[PDB]
Amino acid sequence: GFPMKQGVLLPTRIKLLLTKNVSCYRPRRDGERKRKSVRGAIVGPDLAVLALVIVKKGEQELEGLTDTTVPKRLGPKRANNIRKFFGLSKEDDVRDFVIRREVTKGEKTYTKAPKIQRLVTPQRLQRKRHQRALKVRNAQAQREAAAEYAQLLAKRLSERKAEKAEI
Amino acid sequence: PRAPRTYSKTYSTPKRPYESSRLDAELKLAGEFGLKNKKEIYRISFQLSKIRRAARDLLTRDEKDPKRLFEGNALIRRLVRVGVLSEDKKKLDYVLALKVEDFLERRLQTQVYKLGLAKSVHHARVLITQR
Amino acid sequence: ARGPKKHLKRLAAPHHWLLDKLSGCYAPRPSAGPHKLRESLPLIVFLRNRLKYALNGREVKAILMQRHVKVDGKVRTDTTYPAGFMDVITLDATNENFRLVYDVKGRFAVHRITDEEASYKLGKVKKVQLGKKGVPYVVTHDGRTIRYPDPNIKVNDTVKIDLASGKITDFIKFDAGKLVYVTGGRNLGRIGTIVHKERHDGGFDLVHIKDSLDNTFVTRLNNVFVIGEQGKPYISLPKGKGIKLSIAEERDRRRAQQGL
Amino acid sequence: GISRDSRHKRSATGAKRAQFRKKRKFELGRQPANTKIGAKRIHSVRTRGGNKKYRALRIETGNFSWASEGISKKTRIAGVVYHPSNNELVRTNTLTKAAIVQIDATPFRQWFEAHYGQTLGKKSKNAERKWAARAASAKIESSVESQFSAGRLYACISSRPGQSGRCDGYILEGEELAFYLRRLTAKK
Amino acid sequence: STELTVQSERAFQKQPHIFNNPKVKTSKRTKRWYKNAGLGFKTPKTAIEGSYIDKKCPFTGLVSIRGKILTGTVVSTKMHRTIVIRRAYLHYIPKYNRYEKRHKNVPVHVSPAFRVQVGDIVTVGQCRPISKTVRFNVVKVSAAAGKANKQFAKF
RNA sequence: UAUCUGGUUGAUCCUGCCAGUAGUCAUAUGCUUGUCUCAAAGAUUAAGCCAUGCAUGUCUAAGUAUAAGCAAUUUAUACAGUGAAACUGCGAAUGGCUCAUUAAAUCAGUUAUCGUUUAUUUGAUAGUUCCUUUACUACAUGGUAUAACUGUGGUAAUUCUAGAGCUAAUACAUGCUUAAAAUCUCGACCCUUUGGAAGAGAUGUAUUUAUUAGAUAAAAAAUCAAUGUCUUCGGACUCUUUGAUGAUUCAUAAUAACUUUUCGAAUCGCAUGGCCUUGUGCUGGCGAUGGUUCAUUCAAAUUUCUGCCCUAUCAACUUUCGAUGGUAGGAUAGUGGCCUACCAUGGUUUCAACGGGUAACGGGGAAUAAGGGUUCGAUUCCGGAGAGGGAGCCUGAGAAACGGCUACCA
RNA sequence: GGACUUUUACUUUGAAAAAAUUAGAGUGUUCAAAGCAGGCGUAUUGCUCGAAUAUAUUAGCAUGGAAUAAUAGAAUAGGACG
RNA sequence: GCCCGUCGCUAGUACCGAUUGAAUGGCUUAGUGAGGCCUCAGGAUCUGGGA
Ligand SMILES: [Mg+2]
Ligand SMILES: [Mg+2]
Ligand SMILES: [Mg+2]
Ligand SMILES: [Mg+2]
Ligand SMILES: [Mg+2]
Ligand SMILES: [Mg+2]
Ligand SMILES: [Mg+2]
Ligand SMILES: [Mg+2]
Ligand SMILES: [Mg+2]
Ligand SMILES: [Mg+2]
Ligand SMILES: [Mg+2]
Ligand SMILES: [Mg+2]
Ligand SMILES: [Mg+2]
Ligand SMILES: [Mg+2]
Ligand SMILES: [Mg+2]
Ligand SMILES: [Mg+2]
Ligand SMILES: [Mg+2]
Ligand SMILES: [Mg+2]
Ligand SMILES: [Mg+2]
Ligand SMILES: [Mg+2]
Ligand SMILES: [Mg+2]
Ligand SMILES: [Mg+2]
Ligand SMILES: [Mg+2]
Ligand SMILES: [Mg+2]
Ligand SMILES: [Mg+2]
Ligand SMILES: [Mg+2]
Ligand SMILES: [Mg+2]
Ligand SMILES: [Mg+2]
Ligand SMILES: [Mg+2]
Ligand SMILES: [Mg+2]
Ligand SMILES: [Mg+2]
Ligand SMILES: [Mg+2]
Ligand SMILES: [Mg+2]
Ligand SMILES: [Mg+2]
Ligand SMILES: [Mg+2]
Ligand SMILES: [Mg+2]
């Protein structure tokens, strides 16, 4: 059963330290590496299977292969990704082109479409507006609080020259 | 991890184990106040022993030292309370006196005998132990 | 011990909480906040063990998640939030305000205070420094950063605060003869003016205290919280005004109030 | 790992100390950057509490300042020529703090001849104004001016390359230039 | 200890960040820095007059003095720029209700602002760890030389 | 709560031990056992070994839902309830257990950080991002590649997973933006001065380096090189500003540059309002999550003074291959022989070093009651150490972690 | 704020201090070991006392004393004040 | 009367002792040296020099 691992070369098994983001390993825990047996990337007679990928079709249909097609499961859901599964320009309003999947409820044919994401909306503009506005209003605030101190300081010096001409 | 549950023991047992004299002196007491152990007399003279020890220790500080006035006065008011110490001899060189009998005499087993209500010290022991 | 300790066994708990020996094995470890661990009264302790309001601890969370209680004005949810000396606990239901302020035995008393007075607190400025952009600032014993204070404001002075808003609305210097609250030592909760300070360069300035009963006593500086003039306290005090009676003086008072 | 504890290591009396506890990680040491000259190559290292030291393995420029002229430039670093800790650093051209390097000069030249209008060694209007202003202030210094002829200036690395990924210095000057020159020849 | 040379090292010795602009022809050659350790200790003139370097000088260097101020009697000066003092003290065994003589040596750095010989009572001050053993720095001589010059030849 | 008795002789007085006697939060064992309350308990021997089950997981209105999931209704043809799986986030460094090691170590009391790291809680904190600056940069919002899933599989066998096909974001990876002003550099031109001038670039914060400012110990003057503000054109400079500390090269700020450039909101939930020049323009409520820097709070690490049981049938000890100190560096979160290089010859000791033993974790304390003492503390709280023995490491704020991993030994 | 101070031992008072333990006050857990409670009433919409005190020494800190016991000082005057 | 030593019997303890006797524990020279970490190279694939 041991899996092949691209690029080991070798037509035998070895035991590597595999990490996150690596093939033939799903880490159970953060920063966890388990040492594991691995099969080489060179095909031997000891193989139970050979995983294969067609890249050029021949001169005849293979029964349940060419002849049949199985449809993609999910459709686009991120805003722009819908835009480009129909080639649409930032103009064509994705709301219509989001995919729609029928499904019946005994005697209720029901419909459910994705939650389109990263879509620009009235709401998100109200939030980009508030950001900028607040940055400034604070900035103004700070200045008004700043000079309001500078004064407190300046008309203290204008008391240490009324304390120096008094006594 | 739970806090400690605290306890003390409440009696003390005679140095010499076969003093004929203390023996008689003991039996008689259990005989008069209707006691069942020798422990009921051990307990009390233990009680008596520490009280005296406090007393002893208080009279070593000179008169009118705060702790002496606090803890001393305390010890007396508490004694008179339950009826061990005379109203008059009430300044703790007589708390220094104070034999076992004075303590014995104040038990609810004796009180319940002393104003009749039982007639015989044991009848009292029984009625009390019987609700 | 590999990381921050998260639990608090009883017995290890500060005693001025009045927690009881049995009935458990843990005490509500005070959260991180504006008061040191060992000088706080977690909500859970005050809402249940002082105020007798909730019974379960469980109810204290449930009381709290109504935005019911609120400290210094902000609302505060933390069961084990560290509340502490000079703060202002408030119940909008039961129209009730409290300041946190010390007994004389050394404890936090229950202390009803007016709505008016419930809107401003006192903070011992614990340091003053220059911040980025040369903006000076003070920080006060309850972890308050306040930019732009008076120049005259230096460390150990005390400060009156809007709570409602951020700011400092008055301040009081540390001079011989100034009403002083004592926050630590065996003289915790006592109150008395200031005779004078012992200098001692590089290691614990000392502070001689004289109360309104002509008794005198010392506590290391840091343990002193200035709070007004002889007479005028800048906040309402608790009964007994931190004057500390001898065990005797108390026994006699306690059993003067004896005739039903 | 490397360990900076003192609990190995004999006592002042010279006694031997039992091993008490295993190595903690907070008393860790790591290996030297041993940084060399060459096309830039830096690796970050995750230090305690978030945080990063940049371990420079290969540095070819650095920003060096001519302290008396109140400026700094970024020059190629020519090489290491003196090291007080270990001669092997010099021989292997290893950059560390305090090493003595040679840099480039020609950015400090392009500044000086542009600022004093004077040229080291051997026609605008505002410029002429500004150069006339600067004088009795242009007199460089012998042992430093004589350095530009070879196009290489001696400078002392002031930074810690294995720490921050910078190799930064200051041109050698006055009394300090004397010291190292006396060394560079009284050994030559 | 030092004595002489000042530039006796492989690295050029200098006070950090105390630049002297060679362009400005001056009389003092090297600008020198100094401070007072505080706590009332005078900084000896030999620290301000001298040209020695020492980054462990409490008056001309980058150390601070904070913590125990102790005094002890000098008992070894064989180390260069650092010494060992003995602090004697008596120790109360109860039970017998009397004391016994004890001591400890304490290694301490010693700025060439001071000239110390063995026997001198000296006041030292607490330091950031300065070396493996040394956690103290000589900070005044409450001594002199122990009347050596009144041990001379003959009438 | 200050007590003694029996035993040497023919008898006597001593010396002196054996014996008796009493207590023990002090264990075992024997016999006996009815009630209330209370409630220690595999420490000792073997930190010996372990079958099996359990002991760490976690969701708010508020990161991610096309379950081909449940539900129906109540506006919802993008989404909207509820919600498996899974991604993401945080926790798993606490807790609990044990006492093997450990004798100047730990630990206590007392110090130091002007010698550092710090999730979080709390309080403060950001108009600066692009470009040789009119035919111009997605900001009405830019990139894919992935789990779950679908489907093809492999092995006797595990919390093994391969090949193929989908698709999300507060994952990953990018990348715009805003006032006014001042001050610096450069400087086209013009005109001789005493010289001035359009208008051009630069200036968030963080990083690294160098140079400055950060006064104050009571007061005055001349002169050189620069060169500031106001001319009653000889000149005058007049008010001139300064934080903390016992102490600093402190806090802060300024100059010239540096950087595989730190941070500067492409996020989410409720509400929906104003405002005319009717653009779905331009505004705008409450509060979540974030986010740099500083503070605070929970911590941590190092650390000063003094204090440990028996031992000389342990007297000299320490530098091989650091022992003690100096310079420099490297390494660290940071001091520091912590490591390296060069150099020197130091450091400790009859006031007991060094070595040996401990049937040794240290304390709070426990037992014994005239006092002085003697003995005990594995064990309910604090500290430390460990996870079969060693070593190494990943993740992370925090582990040299063991209900994490890797290797050797058993 | 400056300019400078012979060293110590002892002893007083005080600070800084964990709780449980110990000693000990208050309260009648029916008693007691314990516990830190509880106690009054309008007992139908509340009144109220508490949760002390002590010991905590050796060391370090802080303050009083100046007996007792050490230390240092002026004799080749290189003395002290100006 | 007391009493001393050799010699003899039973039982027990400890010493000396060929066996360069044995066993457990702690350090440790020399040689061999796993594995993670760092570092010089490497380029299965997979994109804009990097991974
Ligand atoms: Mg979204
Ligand atoms: Mg633990
Ligand atoms: Mg908590
Ligand atoms: Mg301080
Ligand atoms: Mg030496
Ligand atoms: Mg006989
Ligand atoms: Mg006989
Ligand atoms: Mg006879
Ligand atoms: Mg006996
Ligand atoms: Mg146990
Ligand atoms: Mg065991
Ligand atoms: Mg749905
Ligand atoms: Mg990709
Ligand atoms: Mg992110
Ligand atoms: Mg000046
Ligand atoms: Mg100042
Ligand atoms: Mg600085
Ligand atoms: Mg609208
Ligand atoms: Mg022996
Ligand atoms: Mg060194
Ligand atoms: Mg030698
Ligand atoms: Mg001895
Ligand atoms: Mg042991
Ligand atoms: Mg113990
Ligand atoms: Mg012991
Ligand atoms: Mg054991
Ligand atoms: Mg551990
Ligand atoms: Mg085991
Ligand atoms: Mg080993
Ligand atoms: Mg481990
Ligand atoms: Mg386990
Ligand atoms: Mg664990
Ligand atoms: Mg005392
Ligand atoms: Mg108590
Ligand atoms: Mg053999
Ligand atoms: Mg290397």
UniProtKB/Swiss-Prot annotation, chain A:
Subcellular location: Cytoplasm; Nucleus, Nucleolus
GO cellular component, one term: cytosolic small ribosomal subunit
TM ranges: none
Biological processes annotated in GO: maturation of SSU-rRNA from tricistronic rRNA transcript (SSU-rRNA, 5.8S rRNA, LSU-rRNA); translation
Keywords, ordered alphabetically: Cytoplasm, Isopeptide bond, Nucleus, Phosphoprotein, Ribonucleoprotein, Ribosomal protein, Ribosome biogenesis, rRNA processing, Ubl conjugation
GO molecular function: structural constituent of ribosome
Covalent link (Glycyl lysine isopeptide (Lys-Gly) (interchain with G-Cter in ubiquitin)) residue numbers: K57, K72, K90, K155
Residues with Phosphothreonine modification: T104
Function, as annotated: Component of the ribosome, a large ribonucleoprotein complex responsible for the synthesis of proteins in the cell. The small ribosomal subunit (SSU) binds messenger RNAs (mRNAs) and translates the encoded message by selecting cognate aminoacyl-transfer RNA (tRNA) molecules. The large subunit (LSU) contains the ribosomal catalytic site termed the peptidyl transferase center (PTC), which catalyzes the formation of peptide bonds, thereby polymerizing the amino acids delivered by tRNAs into a polypeptide chain.
Similarity section: Belongs to the eukaryotic ribosomal protein eS6 family.
Misc: Present with 66000 molecules/cell in log phase SD medium.
Name of this protein: Small ribosomal subunit protein eS6A
Biological classification of the source: Eukaryota, Fungi, Dikarya, Ascomycota, Saccharomycotina
Gene that this sequence comes from: RPS6A
Residues of the full protein shown: 60 to 226 of 236
From Swiss-Prot, chain B:
Disulfide bonds: none
Keyword Chloroplast belongs to the record: no
Gene Ontology BP, a term: translation
Domain of life: Eukaryota
Keywords, ordered alphabetically: Cytoplasm, Isopeptide bond, Nucleus, Phosphoprotein, Ribonucleoprotein, Ribosomal protein, Ribosome biogenesis, RNA-binding, rRNA processing, rRNA-binding, Ubl conjugation
Function comment: Component of the ribosome, a large ribonucleoprotein complex responsible for the synthesis of proteins in the cell. The small ribosomal subunit (SSU) binds messenger RNAs (mRNAs) and translates the encoded message by selecting cognate aminoacyl-transfer RNA (tRNA) molecules. The large subunit (LSU) contains the ribosomal catalytic site termed the peptidyl transferase center (PTC), which catalyzes the formation of peptide bonds, thereby polymerizing the amino acids delivered by tRNAs into a polypeptide chain.
Family according to the record: Belongs to the universal ribosomal protein uS4 family.
Name assigned to this protein: Small ribosomal subunit protein uS4A
Annotated organism of origin: Saccharomyces cerevisiae (strain ATCC 204508 / S288c)
Protein encoded by which gene: RPS9A
Interval of the full protein contained in this chain: 2 to 132 of 197
Curated annotation (Swiss-Prot), chain C:
Any Gene Ontology CC annotation: cytosol
Localization in the cell: Cytoplasm
PROSITE patterns to which the protein is assigned, alphabetical: RIBOSOMAL_S4E, S4
A biological process from GO: cytoplasmic translation
Keyword Transmembrane annotated: no
Modified residues (Phosphoserine): S31, S246
Pfam families the UniProt entry points to: 40S_S4_C, KOW, Ribosomal_S4e, RS4NT, S4
Cross-link Glycyl lysine isopeptide (Lys-Gly) (interchain with G-Cter in ubiquitin): residue positions: K61, K133, K160, K167, K173, K178, K210, K232
Location of Phosphothreonine modifications: T114
Residue ranges occupied by any S4 RNA-binding domain in the UniProt entry: 41-104
InterPro entries named in the record: KOW, Rib_uL2_dom2, Ribosomal_eS4, Ribosomal_eS4_C, Ribosomal_eS4_central_region, Ribosomal_eS4_central_sf, Ribosomal_eS4_KOW, Ribosomal_eS4_N
Membrane-crossing segments per the record: none
Note: Present with 573 molecules/cell in log phase SD medium. There are 2 genes for eS4 in yeast.
Family: Belongs to the eukaryotic ribosomal protein eS4 family.
Official protein name in the record: Small ribosomal subunit protein eS4A
Gene that encodes it: RPS4A
Swiss-Prot record, chain D:
Annotated compartments: Cytoplasm
Pfam family, one: Ribosomal_S8e
Other facts noted in the record for this chain: Present with 15900 molecules/cell in log phase SD medium. There are 2 genes for eS8 in yeast.
Matching InterPro entries: Ribosomal_eS8, Ribosomal_eS8_CS, Ribosomal_protein_eS8_euk, Ribosomal_Se8/biogenesis_NSA2
Chain positions covered by the region annotation Disordered: 1-30
Protein name: Small ribosomal subunit protein eS8A
Residues the record lists as Phosphoserine modifications: S65, S68, S72, S85, S142, S143, S146, S149
Keyword RNA-binding: no
Family: Belongs to the eukaryotic ribosomal protein eS8 family.
Keywords, sorted A to Z: Cytoplasm, Phosphoprotein, Ribonucleoprotein, Ribosomal protein
Single GO cellular component term: 90S preribosome
GO biological process terms, semicolon-separated: maturation of SSU-rRNA from tricistronic rRNA transcript (SSU-rRNA, 5.8S rRNA, LSU-rRNA); translation
Role summary: Component of the ribosome, a large ribonucleoprotein complex responsible for the synthesis of proteins in the cell. The small ribosomal subunit (SSU) binds messenger RNAs (mRNAs) and translates the encoded message by selecting cognate aminoacyl-transfer RNA (tRNA) molecules. The large subunit (LSU) contains the ribosomal catalytic site termed the peptidyl transferase center (PTC), which catalyzes the formation of peptide bonds, thereby polymerizing the amino acids delivered by tRNAs into a polypeptide chain.
Residues recorded as bearing Phosphothreonine in the entry: T61, T106
Superkingdom, natural source: Eukaryota
GO molecular function: structural constituent of ribosome
